[PDB]
């Protein structure tokens, strides 16, 4: 991580491996995509999510400007596009990405056709905690690939993406352990 | 999920599978443990985390009372204890759990010896979003099993736990995909 003055494992690695998502922001020619690991659900009813975004991301500027974002769920198969989203800066990176933008249902920010799911969000809060803004978004629509969620739960065959360390990613075992 | 009036897939399942963690709260005879999926990192420097906790959890009462919590990282091997933490209520459940409580380094809330990591947190914010409180905790200490993080990144052999649907859990493939 940049800005690690005392060399060693970043403390946050203790929560890893974490899922990796894509955050879409802006629209029209301002459409941008970045990689985000620091995403979670914050409410069931209503459905509300949150994502921690550094002020230095172009994505940060776009979410503040428009008050909307999309969380797109990538699979392992689009890793190259995820790595571009997480390493290049601003809307020009899209020319380098195999992803197709399609209209969202409720938000003006586009969805990604290849994503396993697209979760459409309106910003309801933006708190600063240390070196990131935690953008909290009420979910106002969603679409998904029917097969990635057949029978109302994730289908592990879809290769949902997770992040181990800087350059290294994994998916899940297909081997399900039942708790009851 | 309880309180689903219109039967169907909960929208939040679109972020799944998610990692499953344990949240320790209270101390002495009030020590409690629950399961939590809705956890993420919110800052690198300083290291800050957050967890979404329903007001109805005993854990919610204990974090408000003491202003501290521990995120303990379970492996697949302690699934039975995780399921107890996520289904039974209050400190009496501990009598049913194979877990050993040990002192934390900085917080008064105990750590779990069997956990792959224990992340010690002081509450700095508690916002209400829909039906959960998002407790934000500055990390004031941590311990971990050396082997689960050998070479400063997670060791996939440690069987980090993730949640698919209600009763079903998985771990990660050991098969690493390199992005560069
Ligand atoms: C796997 C991965 C996960 C990332 N997660 C986050 C995150 O949660 N929050 C964040 O602010 N940046 C994250 N980053 C960094 C941004 O994706 C990266 O800075 C990107 O180049 C920003 O692009 P932008 O300036 O177009 O918004 C991540 C990068 C990678 C590779
Ligand atoms: C895998 C799993 C994950 C859970 N995640 C959360 C969560 O993120 N937040 C929450 O409030 N409850 C969560 N729950 C529910 C609580 O763990 C459950 O209500 C528990 O019985 C609460 O115990 P307590 O009353 O002792 O705090 C989860 C349950 C399971 C099984
Ligand atoms: O700001 C960041 C958050 C998570 C990452 O994996 C990388 C950068
Ligand atoms: O409040 C809850 C959050 C996540 C869960 O998996 C279960 C309950």
Neighbour count for residue B74 (Cβ, 10 Å): 26
- Closest chain A residue to B144, measured at CA: A14
Overall domain count for chain A: 1
User: Which pairs count as long-range contacts for A87-94, CB under 8 Å and 24+ apart, including other chains?
Assistant: A89/A58, A90/A32, A90/A58, A91/A26, A91/A29, A91/A30, A91/A31, A91/A32, A91/A58, A93/A32, A93/A33, A94/A31, A94/A32, A94/A33
β-strand A48-53 against A39-43: which pairing, if any?
A: antiparallel
Token pair of A150 as six digits: 């057949």
| CA of residue A3 to ligand 1 center, whole Å | 15
- Is B3 inside any structural domain? no
Gap from B87 CA to chain A (nearest CA, Å):
11
Helix, coil or strand: residue B4: coil
Token pair of A30 as six digits: 């301002």
Experimental method: X-ray
Question: The CATH number of the domain where A66 resides is what?
Answer: 2.30.110.10
- Is B90 inside any structural domain? yes
Q: How many angstroms separate the Cα of A102 from the Cα of each of A71, A72, A145?
A: 14, 12, 14
- Is A177 inside any structural domain? no
Rounded Cα gap, residues B152 and A99, in angstroms:
33
Across the interface, do B17 and A154 touch by the CB < 8 Å criterion? yes
Q: Indicate the residue of B19, B47, B144 with minimum beta-carbon distance to A12.
A: B47
Residue with tokens 């039906």: B131
- Is A178 inside any structural domain? no
| CA of residue B112 to ligand 3 center, whole Å | 27
Which of these, A92, A50, A143, A9, lies nearest to B149 by C-alpha position? A9
Token pair of A55 as six digits: 């002020």
Residue A5, H or E segment: none
| CA-CA-CA-CA dihedral for B160, B163, B167, B169, to nearest 10 | -40
Question: Measured in whole angstroms, how far is the alpha carbon of residue B111 from the centre of its chain?
Answer: 12
Rounded Cα gap, residues B37 and B19, in angstroms:
6
Neighbour count for residue A151 (Cβ, 10 Å): 8
Our answer on whether the CB atom of A37 is closer than 6 Å to any ligand 3 atom is yes
Query: Where do the DSSP E strands lie in chain B?
Result: 18-19, 21-25, 32-36, 39-43, 48-53, 68-73, 101-102, 111-112, 117-129, 132-144, 162-165, 168-170, 177-178
Q: How many angstroms separate the Cα of B21 from the Cα of each of A107, A133, A138, B38?
A: 32, 23, 24, 9
- Is A2 inside any structural domain? no
Which of these, A1, A14, A163, lies nearest to B121 by C-alpha position? A14
- Is B21 inside any structural domain? yes
**Experimental resolution (Å):** 1.7
- Is B178 inside any structural domain? no
User: What's the residue count for chain A?
Assistant: 180
Is residue A43 within 8 angstroms of chain B, CB to CB?
Answer: yes
Token pair of A18 as six digits: 């974490």
Which domain does B61 fall in, by range? 8-171
Test mutation, B36, B74, B97, B170, chain A, max A CBs within 10 A? B170
């Amino acid at each position: 991580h940049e800005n690690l003055y005392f060399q060693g494992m970043e403390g946050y690695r203790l929560l890893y491996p974490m899922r990796t998502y894509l955050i879409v922001s802006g629209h029209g020619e301002e459409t941008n995509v970045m990689a985000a690991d620091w995403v979670t659900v914050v409410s069931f009813d209503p459905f509300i999510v949150g994502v921690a975004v550094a002020p230095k991301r172009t994505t940060h500027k776009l979410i503040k400007k428009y008050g909307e974002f999309v969380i797109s769920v990538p699979s392992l198969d689009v890793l190259r596009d995820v790595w571009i989203a997480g390493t290049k800066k601003g809307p020009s990176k899209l020319k380098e990405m195999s992803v197709t933008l399609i209209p969202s249902k409720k938000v003006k920010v586009p969805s990604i056709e290849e994503a396993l799911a697209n979760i459409e969000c309106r910003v309801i809060d933006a708190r600063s905690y240390g070196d990131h803004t935690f953008f909290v978004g009420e979910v106002v629509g969603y679409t998904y690939k029917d097969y990635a969620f057949e029978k109302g739960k994730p289908n592990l065959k879809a290769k949902f993406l997770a992040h181990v360390s800087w350059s290294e990613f994994v998916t899940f075992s297909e081997k399900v352990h039942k708790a009851e």
